[PDB]
Amino acid sequence: QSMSVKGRIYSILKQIGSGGSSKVFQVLNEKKQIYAIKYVNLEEADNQTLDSYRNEIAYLNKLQQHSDKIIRLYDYEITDQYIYMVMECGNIDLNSWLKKKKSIDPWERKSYWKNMLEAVHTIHQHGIVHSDLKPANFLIVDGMLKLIDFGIANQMQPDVGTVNYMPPEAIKDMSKISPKSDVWSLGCILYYMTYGKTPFQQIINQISKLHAIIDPNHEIEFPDIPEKDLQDVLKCCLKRDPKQRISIPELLAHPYVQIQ
Ligand SMILES: CC(C)(C)Nc1nc(Nc2ccc(C(N)=O)cc2)cc(N)c1C#N
Numbered sequence: 402q403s404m405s406v407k408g409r410i411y412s413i414l415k416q417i418g419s420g421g422s423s424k425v426f427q428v429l430n431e432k433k434q435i436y437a438i439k440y441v442n443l444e445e446a447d448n449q450t451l452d453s454y455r456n457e458i459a460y461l462n463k464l465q466q467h468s469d470k471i472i473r474l475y476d477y478e479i480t481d482q483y484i485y486m487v488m489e490c491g492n493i494d495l496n497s498w499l500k501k502k503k504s505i506d507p508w509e510r511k512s513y514w515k516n517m518l519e520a521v522h523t524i525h526q527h528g529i530v531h532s533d534l535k536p537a538n539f540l541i542v543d544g545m546l547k548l549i550d551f552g553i554a555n556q557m558q559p560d561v562g563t564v565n566y567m568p569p570e571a572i573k574d575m576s577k578i579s580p581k582s583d584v585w586s587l588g589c590i591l592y593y594m595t596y597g598k599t600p601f602q603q604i605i606n607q608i609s610k611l612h613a614i615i616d617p618n619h620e621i622e623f624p625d626i627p628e629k630d631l632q633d634v635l636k637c638c639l640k641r642d643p644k645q646r647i648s649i650p651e652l653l654a655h656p657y658v659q660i661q
Contacts, residue, residue: 404428404485406477406487409430409431409487410430411429411430411438413426417437417559417560418557418560419557419560420556422442422445423440423442424439425438427490435490436489437488437490437491438487439484439485439486440483440484441454441485442482450555453553456553457550457553457554458479458484460527461474461551462477468520470516470517470548471520471523471548472489472547473489474487474489489540489542491541491542491547492542492543493540494536494539494559495513495539496535496536496559497559499593505594507627509544511631511658512544513546514634514658515658517546517590518587518649518652518653520539520546521548521583521649524551525649529552530578530579530580530583531586532552532568532571532578532582533556533566533567534552535563535586536590536593537557537559538550565589565600565601565610566589568582568586568643569614570643572615579643581648583649584638584652585646587638588635588638588639591631591634591635592639595626595631595635600621601613617641621639628657630655630657633655634655634657637652638652
């Protein structure tokens, strides 16, 4: 079982993600080089849905020159029936890697954080706010994290979604979503790389989980650790108030990423 994209042929090794009317496959070209092909079935896409895919593609295609911490997009084919995107495959997504992992070499954790910062700082320079960041949005390639998608088209699962990394102001927006919203979620991803759990992962009830995320007087456990800088990045990312929340440009000058 194989497929053609802009003439080149690729044989499916296996499937690695899905969601809505799309699939991601690990495939090989004729030289047995490996890629990930995303397949979108356009059969039932509404004009809004369609336009969100076109847009996501335009920007991904564009932003590749601007950072190497953004997934490679080699080619794509778009008809009225389907889309194929030929991308870089990498090794695995960050959500999978975390679950198959007890603890993380702190040097590797700070390396991963730098990459995440860089990729999101890039999409923000072009006016894009992801607003739904999770570990699944990042790919591990040669020891580097790369951002896989921009939040514009609908989300993929590697293989129910998740509510842990969701920022406060998204929930009170019920305007209002800014770049600081991404800092909350990057915050929850680092929190989890540090303290082996997302901030509210214990509290399995869902209504209550959203309650705790907005609740100013619910407070967050910051178990004391050697890296006091790391400690301070987490506290600054996780300010429930966004005007008080650290920015990405600030985060990039924080001692946690800059010192020693
Ligand atoms: C993460 C998800 C939604 C599946 N999408 C992707 N994944 C990729 N690489 C990958 C490899 C291996 C595993 C794995 N867990 O074995 C996962 C993921 C590469 C990609 N270019 C995309 C996309 N689009």
